[PDB]
Structure formats: structure tokens, C-alpha cells
Amino acid sequence: MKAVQYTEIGSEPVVVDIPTPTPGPGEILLKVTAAGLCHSDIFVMDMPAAQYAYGLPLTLGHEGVGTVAELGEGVTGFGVGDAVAVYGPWGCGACHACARGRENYCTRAADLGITPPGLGSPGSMAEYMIVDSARHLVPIGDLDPVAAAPLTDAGLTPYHAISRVLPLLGPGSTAVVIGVGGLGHVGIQILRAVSAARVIAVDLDDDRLALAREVGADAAVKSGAGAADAIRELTGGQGATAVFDFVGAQSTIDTAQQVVAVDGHISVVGIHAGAHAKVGFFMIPFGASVVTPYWGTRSELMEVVALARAGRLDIHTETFTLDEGPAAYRRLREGSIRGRGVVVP
Amino acid sequence: MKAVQYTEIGSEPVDIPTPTPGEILLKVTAAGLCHSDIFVMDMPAAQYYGLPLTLGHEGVGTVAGFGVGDAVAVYGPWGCGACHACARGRENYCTRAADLGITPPGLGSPGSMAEYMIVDSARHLVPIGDLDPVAAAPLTDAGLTPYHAISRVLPLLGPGSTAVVIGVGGLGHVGIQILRAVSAARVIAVDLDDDRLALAREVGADAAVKSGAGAADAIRELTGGQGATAVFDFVGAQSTIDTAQQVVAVDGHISVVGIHAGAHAKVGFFMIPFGASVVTPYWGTRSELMEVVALARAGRLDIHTETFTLDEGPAAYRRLREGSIRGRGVVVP
Amino acid sequence: MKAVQYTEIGSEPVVVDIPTPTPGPGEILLKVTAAGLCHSDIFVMDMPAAQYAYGLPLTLGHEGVGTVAELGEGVTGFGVGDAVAVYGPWGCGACHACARGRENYCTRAADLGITPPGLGSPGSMAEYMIVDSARHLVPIGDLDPVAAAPLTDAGLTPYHAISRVLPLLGPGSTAVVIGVGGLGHVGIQILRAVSAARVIAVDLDDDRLALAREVGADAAVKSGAGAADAIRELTGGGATAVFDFVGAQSTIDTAQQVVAVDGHISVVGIHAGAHAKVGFFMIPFGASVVTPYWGTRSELMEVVALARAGRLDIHTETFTLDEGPAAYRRLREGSIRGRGVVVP
Amino acid sequence: MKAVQYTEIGSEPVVVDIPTPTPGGEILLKVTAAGLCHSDIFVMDMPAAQYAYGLPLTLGHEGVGTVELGGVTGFGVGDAVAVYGPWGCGACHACARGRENYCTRAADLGITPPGLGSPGSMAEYMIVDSARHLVPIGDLDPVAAAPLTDAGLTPYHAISRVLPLLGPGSTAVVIGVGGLGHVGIQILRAVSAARVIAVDLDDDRLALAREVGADAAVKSGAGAADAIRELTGGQGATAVFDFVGAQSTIDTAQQVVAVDGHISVVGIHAGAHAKVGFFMIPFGASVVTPYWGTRSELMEVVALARAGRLDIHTETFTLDEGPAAYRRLREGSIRGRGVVVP
Ligand SMILES: NC(=O)c1ccc[n+]([C@@H]2O[C@H](COP(=O)([O-])OP(=O)(O)OC[C@H]3O[C@@H](n4cnc5c(N)ncnc54)[C@H](O)[C@@H]3O)[C@@H](O)[C@H]2O)c1
Ligand SMILES: NC(=O)c1ccc[n+]([C@@H]2O[C@H](COP(=O)([O-])OP(=O)(O)OC[C@H]3O[C@@H](n4cnc5c(N)ncnc54)[C@H](O)[C@@H]3O)[C@@H](O)[C@H]2O)c1
Ligand SMILES: NC(=O)c1ccc[n+]([C@@H]2O[C@H](COP(=O)([O-])OP(=O)(O)OC[C@H]3O[C@@H](n4cnc5c(N)ncnc54)[C@H](O)[C@@H]3O)[C@@H](O)[C@H]2O)c1
Ligand SMILES: NC(=O)c1ccc[n+]([C@@H]2O[C@H](COP(=O)([O-])OP(=O)(O)OC[C@H]3O[C@@H](n4cnc5c(N)ncnc54)[C@H](O)[C@@H]3O)[C@@H](O)[C@H]2O)c1
Ligand SMILES: [Zn+2]
Ligand SMILES: [Zn+2]
Ligand SMILES: [Zn+2]
């Protein structure tokens, strides 16, 4: 069985040959149809030995879809060959958060060493993969696998981030999206679907701002030092109802604070080591909340899939063979994938 | 009338004419002194509203759709009344007030530490009935502000949740009571002073623990691993904020309510739990001030005052700075 | 001035000549640019004498848009010439509900004799009108007065009824809109602008079904006894929400027959004595039911914002003041394709 | 093992020796307590035509127990647990939020609750289908724990649905100070600042209501509507939770509710319905019939029980006393909940 795995700290990932797994009881085995590349995957492989805590080796890929190959003893509700998507942020299933589907915010996960596929558990970047538990499988009917893998993260996360504050984004509101990459271009679209918000996109790259318009953005602003003024220029004196920073570097967060509205929100979603928002009197408008959200909930994934199934999310992808796995990650690193990269086994 | 004023930046306070409507005018029955005034009066000429300035943003009074003689309370953060926020009574978050130059009484408009006062518009008065005005004055801010901050994340504080209250001061101690009125949350109080901790218990707290280095651990030892659903920090110093960050739960909330120039929560990955939101809330909303008055009228709020005469004004202030008033401080005309 | 008025119980409205009024202190006078005919008005004029409570004569029109012509003493906030829409459900201004802008749910209006323009207070079907207080005007800017007047009732009410349960209409949800006329056709577009909901519309009339399709419905089906099974056909076993802008027993019955578990019915349309039957074994578990009234201050602000954004496409027919009475007859007969709007 | 089943339509339940059951996936509990819900004195009144739950049926949908297992772990042997009644599919949109009481796939997949189409809790032992249907109760007294699964959960959910309305100044009306209603009163007080007015038919129930925190107490029947308005001023209750559900309690609820208020019809009277239409109910006042409660809502009730925020009035009975206990419930003589201890 072929797979892409991280094997040495600071080394590139490699194509490997390792056993097809079999499902224990309660487990499901998928024949992987599509596996998404997330930029988080990079942030991991950039960890130094001291910080890295995910086991070696690790089959990569926390964006995952496939078909049911083989059931472990006593699993019901699923038939061999039903098409499914994998809910990534696995949790204990039993705590107060888990009971509401919010397994991303599971209070027990850490203690019980429950880790997401691709992030401590064997990932989706192989021909087959195991899902621990049936409730982490979401039905996707005839949905194209290539366009669906991304929904599990590039979809789920922005959706979550938005769902946190969706009551604010009524008519008149303005939402700002910073970074039109994997999560970014999907962000915009989610915002058109479930809100009346005017959407303003922000990227460093001119072609990415075109992709932004392409997928629904009302206006498109060039990133950097002119950004905040251009945004206010667009929002009138008032500012942006919310800011979804899918970059999360210090400059984009600075821009976020410089633009957000009184009683608004900033979602620091993108990860830059040691970048923070500065929330104190005089540094931010009154009542403007700031959060770093994580992935997304059970019911939220089914909502994202519902969005795809309704033809409301036009996902941008590029396909790679398994052997082009390592190559796909040099491409995401250099920034040359216009959307999400996806590895079709 | 007499009217405790602030006429030279960096000093200490004081006899003005008596103003006229044509608008509403109230015989003041009480005036709260907020720590915010001490913040306003350590403001360099630069940073710093107008002088002369009649003090007091916490005001109740009696009128000197409203009966002459009505006992009423003054909604503080005035705004345009006409934006999206103001239409929802959320005038504390009004977008146009700055640009229209609309300032609260005792904060750019003539305040409550006079004997009579003007209130610009009829909507800024909340009927208090036969509630004792001394006890009511605080409601308007020491009640309003923490009520509003507790109102922003109320649905997270169902049974089994935990709320931490940092700074059992004028505001702190009303907040503790609020949490007990409107939630089933476990309340944990924190403070530097051992007498303030006792205050905390008297008004309902489920535990009160010493502020400092041992605070984070002591809090976690009562919450278990999870931490605290909501931290409301009424001190807002960097040390209190650091504590809050170290105890909050995943999917929790931090409300930075106290003001220390240059203190901030640092919100970013590794420095705060996932899903833990932070906000600096400001003052409160119209319907919120009614809700506060409703709690008082039901006997659900036991407000600790200490009365002052129109004259004892300036002395009343130095005691606040000194940390020597147990609860609020109220000036009566 | 020229105005249309209900002058005699059970008679038709007539065009009359009455003095142009003048703002009291606190008040605004408007030069009316547009006035909306609402079916509620017909309901009102159908009332028998005993029920009828709004005084005589009464100047019709509870949907109104104009420009500021005269400020009463003490009124700031507005400049003469400003374009404004009239918030209708006037309230006391001070009560717990009013302070949140929900003057439609004011608890003191009844007691105080505070009634809406055209529904106890002289309406907007005249050359000029009086609005009692400045908070009841909402700026419209350059918005076409003809497509703006319906926002005051025909937008505001659907917007509200939808607001009450919006967290229900996530991706995957379905909403039914029964009755694609004045409110109905606007209710469709709102659902599409502010929710991911799939939208099925329902009407007796085949032209109206097209209108629904034309303004965004994902589907459109014929009202009547066959209507439920066809809605169910579209959904599978049902409908997350039903907004019934007809509110007749037959439609309500359909409504209950198709609402999802933990869904909702908004009974918006008014048929005298028609009611939902909410009780065990007659409605799914969790399915809530409410008769909403009008909408809220911020709500109207928000509806106005939707128009300005170009997300609401309002279908209208224009009438002079004299065609007033003739336009009401057209409404009763059902020959207006959208909202009838009078331009003084 | 001994158990108390309904075996003959129209006939009182009976006590029987049947085999102790075995776990599949499943989990077996030594029932430490089994609550009696007036809902059963409904199911048994069902005519042979509408009754659809199978014969014979171990009665009892409020269970609390001690844990053998199924091949499924996460719970240890002898852990104390409460049982989530309204079983669902665990896979639909409602079930992913934990809202199994609103599971859509349950009637198709023919999934029924214990005591309600599946084997009950009124026995020495019981089967539980899946883990997620077990709630840790820790060291709580099982007699007081059992009513929480239903007499607790049902009112908590009914209240949860509209809690935001119930701020300081709000008024809540509880009709029917019985099993559900007297926990209803206490929940209202723990999680809100609403002023509680209880209504019942009999003085001793009105006593019970004050005993559990009711701000005020009303004699039910015609005079109620007026008596309630005398206490709300001419404004009426923000909320009315009707644990009785008869046309008259419902009627009363319409005549007292506030503009933009809520009526929750929780009691089951066969044919009784609210009449939601213009001129018959205030603008903006919502009605619903809610069903049981959610997984996270049961963790929330347990938490309330655990912090001494609830006092659950019960009378104990043994396995043999069961049948006679229902007669009690029917004639309405139990002060709170009847609970069974094997
Ligand atoms: N919060 C979560 O639960 C979670 C989940 C998934 C991803 N993430 C993080 O979100 C980030 C985005 O992920 P992705 O997979 O979409 O990466 P990506 O490579 O697809 O995104 C790159 C995009 O961001 C733009 N960009 C880079 N720097 C910018 C700048 N300073 N200003 C404006 N735009 C800039 C790029 O030009 C490009 O359009 C990553 O850091 C990832 O780790 C977090
Ligand atoms: N956010 C707003 O819109 C707004 C409105 C009003 C007041 N405030 C602010 O809230 C803060 C408190 O207000 P107050 O008037 O009740 O003050 P107060 O002086 O009456 O209360 C101070 C309390 O805090 C305690 N304290 C000081 N430092 C502490 C620390 N390190 N750890 C624990 N306890 C500590 C003191 O022992 C005392 O009990 C002030 O900074 C004030 O400006 C903010
Ligand atoms: N709830 C409120 O506060 C509020 C506010 C404004 C208007 N209304 C009421 O709402 C209702 C709608 O008013 P409008 O002005 O939009 O009416 P309208 O005359 O403009 O629209 C009538 C539409 O309903 C359709 N219709 C009639 N019977 C039908 C049936 N059995 N099935 C499907 N469609 C049917 C007609 O075909 C027509 O398209 C009226 O009853 C009006 O009085 C209520
Ligand atoms: N909605 C749900 O999912 C659900 C769940 C559980 C129970 N229930 C139903 O709720 C109801 C109450 O259950 P219970 O076991 O607590 O009943 P109970 O017998 O334990 O209590 C009944 C109480 O209501 C009082 N009462 C009777 N008629 C009255 C009236 N006219 N006005 C005021 N009070 C009156 C009685 O005196 C008694 O105090 C039942 O109908 C039951 O089936 C519904
Ligand atoms: Zn990722
Ligand atoms: Zn968990
Ligand atoms: Zn203050």
C-alpha cells in the first residue's frame, strides 16, 4: 500500500510502501478517493524536533474522503462503497462538548491521546485509511471526491469561524477575508451563501485577488500598508463588521484591528508562530471580540457538504498522483497552487 | 447649586448657576463616584473633555410620558439614537456619537455631582419607582457594566459552567451577584485584599482566592483540568490578564473590563486555548439598564454603598484612589 | 390636499380634500413620494361596525415613503429634503420592548391610544403626512420611492417573520412560502439573500407561481389539497420552516401537514377566525407556531440595506391619487402583480 | 430477574419472572432506581387500535443504574449512570447536535426508547443500546437521580428553548405541580431570574410549589387567568409552561401570555390543542409541543442535581409494589415522583 509520510525532522516527506491496515471493532476502512493538502501540514513539518509531537513516521493528510472498503466487527449504518468524508478533529465522543458535536473543542482529547488523522493518527494520503469511529463519517452521495476532500478543512474551518458570529453578518454588514488560498477562496463563498454580507478580499498576490472576484468577492484589496485605509475607504468611517484573517501574521492582525468595527469580531484563523492580537483598551474598538477558532463541529461539516451538494461552493483544486505527493508540498510551500491541492490515490 | 468640579488638569475638585430645560431637569437624589474619574484625572493635559466639568456619570434623581416627581435613573453612554446600534438601544456602541460630539454626563457633558442636572433626551431615563436612590445610583454603571459584560456570553454559563470574577471592587461585587441571579454557574472570586474576599462570599461567591502568583494554580485546582468557562477581569492589569489567559477553558471567554493603560490580552495560537474569545466591553445597553433595575427591585442585588454629602466630594475621591471604600461611594445633594 | 379615505363603514374609499397638516413640536411633515396598498387595508374596510376601531374618516396607507418638508420644533437629525421611509408599528418608545426597537411588541401602545399611520392615525395615502417622532423615519438615500414604500410593510413583515427563526435555515434547510403576492414575493428574495435555505413557493395562481420562480424560488407548486404531498415529494420526510402569507385554514392545515420535526410555522396572513391547531399528534414535536406582527426598527434598517445592495427586486404597479379607490378594487380582485403603489 | 410489564390492552400492568437479558455493543445495568411517569398512565389508557408499542413491555422510561459491558469500553464495571431516554440514530443532523429527541431517522429505522417500545427500567437489570446513551452521575443518590432523566430533562428542555426571554423582569408560569412541574419550578430559579407563579388544582400541590421556590401560587380553573394577571399587572406572563396540557390549562395559557411571549404545551391530553391565530393569541407569542430533551441537556440537569440546585420529592416502592404505585399516580396521590428500587 502506497502512502506519503513524514519520516525525518526537517526532511521532505517521502513516498513509502507500508501495510494495508484492517479495521478493529468499531473502525471503518476507506479506499481513499481524494486527499487534500493543507498549509497546516507544512507548519508541522517545519516544527523542530523539540516541539514536534506527532509520531514518526506519520502518514499525512487531514483532509480526507473515500469509500467504505471494509467494516470492523459490529459497525452499522454504513454499506461497503457508500461515499464519505472524514470529520477530522476527533474527540472523546462523551464530554459536554462532544455531545453537541463540538469534538474540536473536546475537553478530554489531549488526556486520552486522541489525535486527528494526519496529525498523530495515520492520515489520508495513502490508498486506504482507517477511521476510528462511524460518527466521524459524513455521507457525500454522488459528490465529486476531488472537490469534496477540501470541504473537510478548507471548508469546515472557515464555516466554523463564520458560524461563531453569523448573527452579526446581517444586511449592511461587511466581512473581510485575508488570504485567498485553500481556506480563503472557500471562505468568501460561504459568506455569500449563508449571509447578506458585503465581502472584501485581501491578498498579497494580484492573481489571488482575481480568484477572489472569481468566487464571489464584492471588492478586492491589495495587502500591505495601504490595506487598512483602503478597507475603511470602502466601509465608510464605520469599519468592517468582521475580519477573517486566514493568514494570521502580525501585519494582517494589525490590519485587522485597524479596520474592525465597534462591537465587531476578528477571527485569527491562520497560524504564524508567536503572532497575536492585542486586545486592550485603546488598542481595539470597544466590544470587538477576537478568537482563534479550531477546525469545526459535526453538524457544521454536514452543513458544508449540504452547501457543496446544493452547488453553492465552487472549490478550486489541482490533482496530483501519490508519487507527486512530495512535489505537491514543494508547490504549496512556494505558493503556486491556485486553490487547494488534492492527491487522488 | 453646589457642584463638585475638576477645573485644572492634575489637581483636586470644588458653586455654579442652576441650569434650565427646553430636554429634562432632575433634582439629584444620588451620585456614584466611579474609579474611571480617577483614571480621567490622572490624564495629562494632552490625552485629556472641557473644563469646567461637573462630575458624576452614575446619577439618579427626581423630575424637577413622564410625571413631574418621578424617581428615575440616568442611562450613561448617550448616542445618536438613530444608527443601527442605537435603534437596538445599544447606544454604548453608537457609531455616530464621536463625530456628532455626543458625550456622557460627567464625561463631556454636565454631570451628576450637582444638586440639579440636565438630561438631553427622554429615552435616557429609566423609571426606578420607590427604589432607594443611594442604592440605585451605582446600578447605572457598577451594575450596568458588568451586567452587559455577563450578557455578551450568558448562554455559555449553563449548569456545570464556572465563572471567575477578578477584582471584587465596586463593580466586582455587583457582578458576583448578577451571575448568581441569571446563571447556574459556579462563581470564583479573586482579589489582592483579604477583606474583599470575604465581601465576595457574603454576596454569594462559591470560592474566593488570593490574587497573585498562586492564583492560576489555585483556580485550576478547583476547576480541574478544564479551567474556567468565563473570566471577567474587573482590574484589567497585565498580571490579571495573564492569570485569565492561564485559566480559561477551551471555547471559553475573557472579558477585560478594568482599565490599565497599555494592558492587553495576547490572542494567538499557543498563547490562549482554542475557541477562547476576548473582548473589552464598554458600559451597557438601554434594555440592559432596565434589566439591572429589575434585579434591584426584586431584592436580587445587595449594593454596598458608603454615603457622602455634597461637601465631602473631594475627600470621597482620595479614599477611592486609596482602596478604602468597601463597595461603591455615593454622593447625596 | 388630496387624500384617500375610508369615510363610511362598508363603503368604498373616496378621494377627498382636507387641510394639509403642520408638524407639532417633535413631529415631521413629509411630502409623500410613494404609498403602498396592503391587503390588510381591505381586511380593515371589511370589518363590521362593531369591530372597526380606527376612527372615521381615516386616511389610508400604512406603507409610506417621502421627503422631509417641515421639521417641528426641536427636531434635529434631519435636513429638509431628506428621503425617508416610515416605520409603521409606532410604540411608546420607553418600555422594555421599545428600547430594543421592537415597537411592534410595545406593551403600552394599546393603553396610550398609539396607533399606526393609516391604522388609527392619518396615513400616507395623501400629498403630505405627519410622523409623530423622528425615530420613526429611516433614511433611504437615492432609492427609488416606488420600490421603497413596500419595504415598510411587505419587506419588514416577511423579514421579521424570517428573523424569528433564522438560525433554523442553515444549508440543507427548506423554507415554504405560501402566498406569492405583495409580501410573498419579497419574502422569497429575503430568504435567498440571508439564508442558504432551499425555497418552495405556493399559490392558487399560475402567474404567481411564475413570479415566484422569477424572483428566486427553487420550486413552485399549486396550492390546495394536493399541495402537501407535492411539497413532501420535494423534501423527503419535511419543511424546516413554513411562512404562510395567506393564513387561511386550508393553508395552515397544509402548513402543519408539511413542517419538519423541530421546525416552525409563521402564520402571517389573516383569515378571521382561522388558526393553527398546536397539540400532540396534530403537529410534529418541536415545531413552533407564531402569528408575528409587522417588524422592528433595526429590522426595517436592514430591509432598506438589502434594497440598496440590489438584493431585493420589488414588483410594482403605479397609481395616481385619483386611481386610489380603483387600485383597492384591483387589489381585492387579485389583479395586481406585486404591490400597488400610489404616487401623489 | 423480576420486572413489571403491561401485557393486556385495557388491563393493569403485572409483575413477572423473565430471563435476565444479555449485552450485544450494548451495556447491562443493575437498575438502582426506576421512575414512574404519568406518561405511562397514558400509554396504558391507549385503546388496542392506536397502541403501537408491543406486548409484553417492561415499563419505565426513567432509569438509573450500575454498569456487564457489550465489545465496547470507556465505562468501568459498576460505574453509576443515568440513561438518556429518547434514543436516536446518532448520525442525522439533529443527532449530531445530540438532539436525539428530534432524530428524523428513528421512526423509519424503527428505533424506540426503553419502556416505550423497547425493554424498560422497571426490572432488576436492563439493556442500553449504545454508550453515548449513558450519563455519569457519580455518587448521586439514585432515587433522586431517576426522575432527572425525564421529570428533569423534559422541563429543562422546554425551558431551554426560550430561556433568553426569561431575564430579570420576566415572569414564568408553571401549570401542574406534579412530577415534571416541581422540577420545572426549581430549574426556572437556578438558570434564570424569572418570577415563578405556579398553578395547580389542589392546595397541597400549591404548598409543594412554594416549598420548591415558587414566588406565588394559584388555584387552577376559571379564576386562574384573572389571578395571574393581578400579579403580572396587565402585561401577562413572559412564559407559560403547561405540564398538564388539557384544553382548560391551555386555554388559560392563551389568556395570560405576553405579547412576544411563549406557551410550551408539555402535558398530554388527547385532543387538546392551542389555537394559534389572530385575535386568539397576542402578536409574537410562540407555541410549541416539545418532546423530552437533548444529550447535553441531560448533562446539564445532572450538573444542577450535583450542585444541590434541585430537590426531588419522591416516594419509594419495591418491584412488587409497582402496579399499585401506578394506581396511586392515576388517582394522583404521590407527592412528586414515585420511584422503584430493586
Ligand atoms: N484555525 C484552524 O483550525 C486551521 C485550520 C486549517 C488551516 N489553518 C491555517 O490557516 C492558514 C491558511 O491555510 P491554507 O491551507 O489556505 O494556506 P494557503 O497557502 O492556501 O494560503 C495562502 C494564501 O494566503 C495568502 N497570503 C500569504 N501571506 C499573505 C499576506 N501577508 N497578506 C495577504 N495574503 C497572504 C497567499 O498569497 C495565498 O493566497 C495556514 O496557516 C493554516 O495553517 C488553521
Ligand atoms: N469597561 C468599562 O466600560 C468600565 C466602566 C466602569 C468601570 N470600569 C473599570 O473597572 C475597574 C474596577 O472598577 P471599580 O470602580 O469597581 O474599582 P474599585 O476600586 O471599586 O475596586 C477595586 C477592587 O479591585 C481590587 N484589585 C486591585 N488590583 C487587583 C489585582 N491585582 N488582583 C485582584 N484584585 C485587585 C481591589 O482590592 C478592590 O477590591 C476600574 O479600572 C474601572 O475603570 C470600566
Ligand atoms: N402578519 C402581519 O403583521 C401582516 C403584515 C402585512 C400584511 N399581512 C397579511 O398577510 C396577508 C398577505 O397580504 P398581501 O398584501 O401580501 O396579500 P396580496 O393580495 O398582495 O397577495 C395575495 C396572494 O396570496 C395568494 N393566495 C390567496 N389564497 C391562496 C391560497 N389558498 N394558497 C396559496 N396562495 C394564495 C394569491 O394568489 C396572491 O398571489 C394578508 O392576509 C394581509 O392582511 C400581515
Ligand atoms: N412533552 C413530553 O416529552 C413529556 C414528557 C414527560 C411527561 N409528559 C407529560 O406531562 C404531564 C405531567 O406528567 P407528570 O408525571 O408530572 O404528571 P403528575 O401526575 O406527576 O402531575 C400532575 C399534576 O398536575 C396537576 N393537575 C391536574 N389537572 C390540573 C389542572 N386542571 N390544572 C392545574 N393542575 C392540574 C395534578 O394535581 C398534579 O399535581 C403528563 O401528561 C405527561 O405524560 C410529557
Ligand atoms: Zn488544515
Ligand atoms: Zn469529548
Ligand atoms: Zn464608570
Ligand SMILES: [Zn+2]
Ligand atoms: Zn447611534
Ligand SMILES: [Zn+2]
Ligand atoms: Zn400591512
Ligand SMILES: [Zn+2]
Ligand atoms: Zn413601548
Ligand SMILES: [Zn+2]
Ligand atoms: Zn415521561
Ligand SMILES: [Zn+2]
Ligand atoms: Zn438521528
